[PDB]
Ligand SMILES: NCCNC(=O)N1CCC[C@H](C(=O)Nc2ccc(Cl)c(F)c2)C1
Ligand SMILES: *[C@@H]1O[C@H](CO)[C@@H](O)[C@H](O)[C@H]1NC(C)=O
Ligand SMILES: *[C@@H]1O[C@H](CO)[C@@H](O)[C@H](O)[C@H]1NC(C)=O
Ligand SMILES: *[C@@H]1O[C@H](CO)[C@@H](O)[C@H](O)[C@H]1NC(C)=O
Ligand SMILES: *[C@@H]1O[C@H](CO)[C@@H](O)[C@H](O)[C@H]1NC(C)=O
Ligand SMILES: *[C@@H]1O[C@H](CO)[C@@H](O)[C@H](O)[C@H]1NC(C)=O
Ligand SMILES: *[C@@H]1O[C@H](CO)[C@@H](O)[C@H](O)[C@H]1NC(C)=O
Ligand SMILES: *[C@@H]1O[C@H](CO)[C@@H](O)[C@H](O)[C@H]1NC(C)=O
Ligand SMILES: *[C@@H]1O[C@H](CO)[C@@H](O)[C@H](O)[C@H]1NC(C)=O
Ligand SMILES: *[C@@H]1O[C@H](CO)[C@@H](O)[C@H](O)[C@H]1NC(C)=O
């Protein structure tokens with residue numbers, strides 16, 4: 001057939017258990033339809049489509065949905081919002097992101113890039129066409145992208161413009177790294193155990209890959225030097241508890257006696273700078289007992305340092321804050337068009 005680049009309102013789908021008390025299931029149970037029981041994907045032969053992950057409206061729409069999900073599902077005791085302040089009940093909630101499918105209404109279709117080393121921008125020569133994206137888990141975090149998909153070939157570097165150092169860099173890993181984070185039975189004391197062996201290996205590979213994009217220059221990793229706790233640390237939510245974990249051991253250029261298990265120190269903060277921008281909020285103290293999540297690190301968000309134009313090296317620090325980049329990391333291979 002034929003089509004034309006177009007933006008329209010998408011709808012969502014899920015496998016939300018209607019009996020579930022969990023907040024992602026509850027939101028999906030009443031804001032999304034059931035997943036396509038017979039999903040039909042059909043490859044388009046001799047067709048080349050130009051995709052642009054950084055200028056894609058599916059990002060902004062999914063981002064809209066996640067603010068909605070969080071605003072109805074999270075119960076802070078007090079919300080400080082731009083001069084207003086609201087007290088409330090803050091019961092414990094059950095939190096565990098479920099995949100969400102995004103789907104075009106009639107008159108529109110979703111194009112999907114299957115070029116395996118597609119970097120997100122430019123043309124794609126193996127294009128399919130779907131009614132619905134795949135199941136995307138909306139995991140909220142900084143620096144480390146958790147529980148996502150992997151690049152099926154090489155490690156991929158994505159940025160709207162690598163020459164601009166204000167542009168976030170998204171590295172898509174081809175090998176997942178486990179991050180196992182516990183708060184066992186100070187109650188906010190917590191920690192993350194990562195296999196230093198595997199981690200160091202793939203960071204060297206990132207290093208390798210990054211050097212390609214930077215004329216063989218020297219690649220150096222550093223901790224963030226400026227920003228709120230949420231972006232200077234690895235922030236994420238595990239079972240309703242906001243985790244803040246120190247990344248300094250995972251970005252030491254020493255090991256790019258150090259192959260055991262890295263133990264990142266962590267704190268469970270009750271007062272957080274909300275990622276939606278609204279302000280700052282307070283929550284109740286953590287649950288009794290063992291609070292643990294085992295996640296897959298599938299990508300890394302990084303920022304290059306400015307002012308290295310005639311310098312010997314390039315400096316990269318873990319990044320985050322704009323969580324459209326997180327949706328970016330899974331919606332890059334997709335584009336919405338209207339059948340003409
Ligand atoms: N390049 C964009 C700059 N980003 C920015 O200015 N923000 C405003 C202040 C910090 C905000 C934040 O990231 N919050 C947060 C909360 C909970 C979790 Cl779990 C998490 F992963 C993150 C983001
Ligand atoms: C196109 O992508 C499909 C699905 O990812 C995969 O089988 C292969 O890489 C490509 N197939 C052809 C015929 O080009
Ligand atoms: C992505 O690929 C396009 C060519 O399709 C190229 O113009 C662009 O520089 C590449 N970007 C990165 C970050 O590799
Ligand atoms: C972690 O990664 C493996 C493959 O590396 C995958 O099979 C598994 O489902 C992933 N776990 C989660 C929770 O996504
Ligand atoms: C991941 O990509 C790197 C190149 O970036 C490659 O050397 C390595 O073999 C890949 N690993 C896997 C498991 O695909
Ligand atoms: C990328 O960023 C640099 C520096 O901000 C800018 O000079 C340039 O115009 C941008 N785009 C390209 C294609 O280089
Ligand atoms: C995660 O760590 C805890 C304590 O550090 C341990 O009991 C548990 O077996 C670990 N789980 C995995 C999957 O490694
Ligand atoms: C670290 O990961 C490697 C795989 O590369 C594996 O040999 C080992 O199980 C892991 N380390 C520990 C202490 O379990
Ligand atoms: C960058 O270094 C690699 C090292 O393997 C070399 O092969 C390559 O020639 C260098 N750069 C360019 C632009 O060729
Ligand atoms: C992370 O830990 C290092 C020491 O290991 C410390 O110097 C640094 O201040 C910590 N980061 C933050 C944001 O506090």
Ligand SMILES: *[C@@H]1O[C@H](CO)[C@@H](O)[C@H](O)[C@H]1NC(C)=O
Pocket residue numbers: 096097139146147236237238239293294295296
């Ligand atoms: C990643 O997925 C696993 C398995 O579904 C889950 O236990 C864990 O909480 C997830 N991690 C995050 C940060 O949501």
